[PDB]
Amino acid sequence: SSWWSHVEMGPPDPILGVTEAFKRDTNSKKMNLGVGAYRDDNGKPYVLNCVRKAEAMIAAKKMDKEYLPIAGLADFTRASAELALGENSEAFKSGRYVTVQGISGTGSLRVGANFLQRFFKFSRDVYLPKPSWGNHTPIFRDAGLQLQAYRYYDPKTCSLDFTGAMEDISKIPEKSIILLHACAHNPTGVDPRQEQWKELASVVKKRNLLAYFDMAYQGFASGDINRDAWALRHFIEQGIDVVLSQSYAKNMGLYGERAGAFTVICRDAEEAKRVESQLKILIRPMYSNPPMNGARIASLILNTPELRKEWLVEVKGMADRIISMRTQLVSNLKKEGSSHNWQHITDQIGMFCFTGLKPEQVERLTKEFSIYMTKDGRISVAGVASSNVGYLAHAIHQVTK
Amino acid sequence: SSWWSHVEMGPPDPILGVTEAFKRDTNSKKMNLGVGAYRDDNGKPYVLNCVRKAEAMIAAKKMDKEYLPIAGLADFTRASAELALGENSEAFKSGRYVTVQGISGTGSLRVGANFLQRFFKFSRDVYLPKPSWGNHTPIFRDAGLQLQAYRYYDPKTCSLDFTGAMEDISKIPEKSIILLHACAHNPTGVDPRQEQWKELASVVKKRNLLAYFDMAYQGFASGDINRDAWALRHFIEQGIDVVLSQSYAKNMGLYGERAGAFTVICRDAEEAKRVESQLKILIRPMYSNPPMNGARIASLILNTPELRKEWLVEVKGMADRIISMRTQLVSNLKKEGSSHNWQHITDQIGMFCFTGLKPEQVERLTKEFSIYMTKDGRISVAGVASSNVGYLAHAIHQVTK
Numbered sequence: 001s002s003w004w005s006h007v008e009m010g011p012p013d014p015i016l017g018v019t020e021a022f023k024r025d026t027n028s029k030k031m032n033l034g035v036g037a038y039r040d041d042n043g044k045p046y047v048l049n050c051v052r053k054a055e056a057m058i059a060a061k062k063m064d065k066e067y068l069p070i071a072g073l074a075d076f077t078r079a080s081a082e083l084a085l086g087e088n089s090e091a092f093k094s095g096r097y098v099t100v101q102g103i104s105g106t107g108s109l110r111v112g113a114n115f116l117q118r119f120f121k122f123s124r125d126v127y128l129p130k131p132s133w134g135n136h137t138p139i140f141r142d143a144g145l146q147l148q149a150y151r152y153y154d155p156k157t158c159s160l161d162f163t164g165a166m167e168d169i170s171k172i173p174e175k176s177i178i179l180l181h182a183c184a185h186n187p188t189g190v191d192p193r194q195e196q197w198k199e200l201a202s203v204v205k206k207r208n209l210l211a212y213f214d215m216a217y218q219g220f221a222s223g224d225i226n227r228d229a230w231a232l233r234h235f236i237e238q239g240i241d242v243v244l245s246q247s248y249a250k251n252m253g254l255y256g257e258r259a260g261a262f263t264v265i266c267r268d269a270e271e272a273k274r275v276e277s278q279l280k281i282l283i284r285p286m287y288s289n290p291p292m293n294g295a296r297i298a299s300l301i302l303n304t305p306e307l308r309k310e311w312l313v314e315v316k317g318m319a320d321r322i323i324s325m326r327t328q329l330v331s332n333l334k335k336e337g338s339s340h341n342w343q344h345i346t347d348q349i350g351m352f353c354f355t356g357l358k359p360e361q362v363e364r365l366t367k368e369f370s371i372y373m374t375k376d377g378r379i380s381v382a383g384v385a386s387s388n389v390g391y392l393a394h395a396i397h398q399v400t401k
Numbered sequence: 402s403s404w405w406s407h408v409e410m411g412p413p414d415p416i417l418g419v420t421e422a423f424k425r426d427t428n429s430k431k432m433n434l435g436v437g438a439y440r441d442d443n444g445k446p447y448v449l450n451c452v453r454k455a456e457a458m459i460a461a462k463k464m465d466k467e468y469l470p471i472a473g474l475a476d477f478t479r480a481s482a483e484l485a486l487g488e489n490s491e492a493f494k495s496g497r498y499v500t501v502q503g504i505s506g507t508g509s510l511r512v513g514a515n516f517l518q519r520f521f522k523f524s525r526d527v528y529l530p531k532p533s534w535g536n537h538t539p540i541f542r543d544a545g546l547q548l549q550a551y552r553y554y555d556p557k558t559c560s561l562d563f564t565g566a567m568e569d570i571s572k573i574p575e576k577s578i579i580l581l582h583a584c585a586h587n588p589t590g591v592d593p594r595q596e597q598w599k600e601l602a603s604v605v606k607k608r609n610l611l612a613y614f615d616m617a618y619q620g621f622a623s624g625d626i627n628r629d630a631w632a633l634r635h636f637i638e639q640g641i642d643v644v645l646s647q648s649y650a651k652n653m654g655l656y657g658e659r660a661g662a663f664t665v666i667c668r669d670a671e672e673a674k675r676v677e678s679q680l681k682i683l684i685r686p687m688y689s690n691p692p693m694n695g696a697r698i699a700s701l702i703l704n705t706p707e708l709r710k711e712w713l714v715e716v717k718g719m720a721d722r723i724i725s726m727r728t729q730l731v732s733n734l735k736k737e738g739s740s741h742n743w744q745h746i747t748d749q750i751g752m753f754c755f756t757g758l759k760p761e762q763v764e765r766l767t768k769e770f771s772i773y774m775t776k777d778g779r780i781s782v783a784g785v786a787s788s789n790v791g792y793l794a795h796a797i798h799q800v801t802k
């Protein structure tokens with residue numbers, strides 16, 4: 001009897017645990033469709049061109065490694081607020097925002113969850129779509145709030161349960177918190193239609209609910225960043241003061257460097273100035289100040305005309321390629337002799353597909369073909385190259401056939 | 402009445418807030434002796450030679466930016482455990498350790514604080530020296546444990562209150578937690594003497610207290626890393642299973658990149674394997690995985706014969722130079738006509754000096770000479786160059802004279 005004799009064996013990460021098991025496999029044909037991670041068309045991890053150049057200039061500068069303020073790099077902070085909101089925005093123009101550099105999306109999400117825990121005096125409840133990205137549950141629980149749900153997907157029709165959503169949303173108690181994904185819903189690939197987004201807005205506004213936007217895939221739903229941010233900005237200008245988490249993990253392909261941000265839209269420049277201070281008191285006893293590299297790459301890109309330009313060409317190339325792969329998937333499916341309807345595959349947007357495979361089929365896939373995906377049937381199409389689309393097709397067919 | 406109208410203006414960081422105010426000053430002679438941060442002898446932020454080369458090789462490799470496991474870079478993890486413990490160690494030889502890459506010292510400290518909160522079933526109390534590094538209070542409080550104190554420094558004699566320490570320590574309730582600094586006590590510069598460390602050990606062991614070591618300055622107390630780790634290893638081999646936080650923020654001069662680690666010495670390889678899993682469940686809903694750059698630089702240095710070698714030459718050069726500056730300080734003091742006793746200046750070890758200046762003197766210093774330090778009278782000698790030792794001396798004298 002030791003200090004830790006009572007500490008039991010906790011299970012591997014639902015998602016993250018998929019790269020683990022993937023690593024270990026000896027099949028030369030294994031494919032990791034586990035986490036939303038882009039592979040170029042050789043299915044080689046891809047580092048954007050503009051990032052490679054952003055690193056070169058920093059390099060060249062012979063920059064110091066001195067501690068960054070508790071809120072992060074001013075320049076990255078400010079440039080993110082902008083990417084989120086648009087430069088014309090009254091919110092942005094007026095300075096009624098506070099943006100803190102955070103530990104990528106996951107970290108922004110959590111500083112955010114702990115901020116609310118601490119200053120959101122109106123409710124302990126955070127309402128999450130059904131289904132949501134797995135980590136939302138624990139981020140929120142470890143922070144100290146309660147979890148609730150609003151109906152989102154409908155597996156019968158492979159899309160948005162707009163009447164059911166509208167119903168749960170309409171009954172959320174005034175002033176609770178609700179998590180909405182900005183675009184490329186994870187895990188479903190289904191997003192409200194402009195029109196729907198206008199309606200959600202109304203009911204959100206009407207119930208005076210605190211809107212919390214998870215924006216990890218901006219430029220991944222349509223190949224266009226301003227378009228992707230539509231719903232977000234439509235809210236704020238409808239008079240909704242949101243909170244949001246942003247990640248550069250996928251759109252900049254900055255994954256392991258970890259760069260993200262957390263923002264609060266307040267009412268004044270003075271309120272923003274007051275929240276900033278508190279965000280900083282909260283963040284100090286956490287990790288004191290954040291990782292400088294990712295913030296530095298991104299800020300040079302966002303703030304360098306040519307670097308941003310290149311950035312959109314290449315954020316465009318990624319969205320497209322995911323599209324050719326969806327296309328081609330469906331195609332081989334039919335070509336392999338698939339009897340099923342694979343329309344959702346090319347219907348869905350973002351990095352994933354929500355295929356509908358049942359667990360024994362997901363399991364056989366892993367075991368017989370070395371194709372690694374989460375057991376909810378979600379596969380990352382992000383991860384498919386011209387070279388293995390055939391292989392996935394076949395596999396999919398065998399196990400389904 | 403907004404969401405955040407009730408959120409008040411919290412004060413600037415006690416330490417961190419000193420770089421802020423420093424930044425803003427227009428005096429060409431301002432000096433920032435606020436945070437423990439090394440400046441070369443031009444008093445220019447210094448990036449070690451071996452780091453500059455570590456970056457070059459990574460660069461050259463054209464490494465990917467893919468997500469790292471929840472526990473960090475295996476290689477950095479393992480190499481830190483070693484730097485902490487020594488390669489001969491039974492602890493290390495046997496694998497009864499779990500090391501998680503964390504968000505520098507501050508972050509390791511907190512993962513650690515939350516781990517305890519969650520699995521340390523024996524007490525909610527963490528006993529901190531008097532005085533301790535400021536952030537210890539809030540790290541620990543935000544995590545959820547209670548704070549307590551053991552007498553440490555004695556301002557009458559400018560040293561260790563060994564009878565008072567021994568007394569408080571001897572009365573700590575069995576199984577509580579106690580934070581001990583490994584070397585270069587922050588803020589005092591006073592460390593137990595080998596002999597004292599042997600005695601602390603006994604009373605710790607005897608009371609069956611959970612020893613928590615904060616090791617942020619290894620190679621800063623003596624210019625020698627193995628020596629610096631003496632007390633730490635002496636504990637474990639006396640049968641004490643500790644927990645420790647390590648930082649590479651000062652010894653690698655990796656400040657803003659943020660690389661650190663948190664370790665638990667358990668009883669077996671299987672227990673270690675069980676704690677690892679739980680550490681990872683805890684860390685996932687936090688920041689999902691940590692900043693890859695610092696971990697990558699450090700691991701190439703620690704694990705490259707030539708890179709480590711260079712590393713010690715240069716960790717030796719930093720300790721030395723801090724010594725010449727202390728020396729010279731005292732010297733000018735006398736030369737400026739100082740009536741006081743400045744023996745503690747050269748008596749103390751590490752990055753700081755605990756000068757004894759009262760707040761009105763600290764204040765005048767800031768205001769008349771542009772010398773920025775914390776109000777506890779602590780100055781970072783780390784920060785003095787051959788060029789400004791004269792200036793500090795004078796200043797010190799004026800305000801003291």
Ligand SMILES: Cc1ncc(COP(=O)(O)O)c(CNOCC(=O)O)c1O
Pocket residue numbers: 015016035036103104105106107133135181186214216247248249255260688689
């Ligand atoms: C919707 C959503 N929000 C937020 C995030 C967080 O991403 P990051 O922390 O990498 O910025 C992700 C990241 N996902 O990919 C990795 C995983 O499941 O852990 C995500 O899908």
Ligand SMILES: Cc1ncc(COP(=O)(O)O)c(CNOCC(=O)O)c1O
Pocket residue numbers: 287288416417436437504505506507508534536582587615617648649650656661
């Ligand atoms: C004793 C001690 N432990 C732990 C730490 C944490 O250092 P880091 O998080 O930079 O690794 C420090 C860092 N101090 O310098 C910066 C500050 O006061 O915030 C320290 O002195």
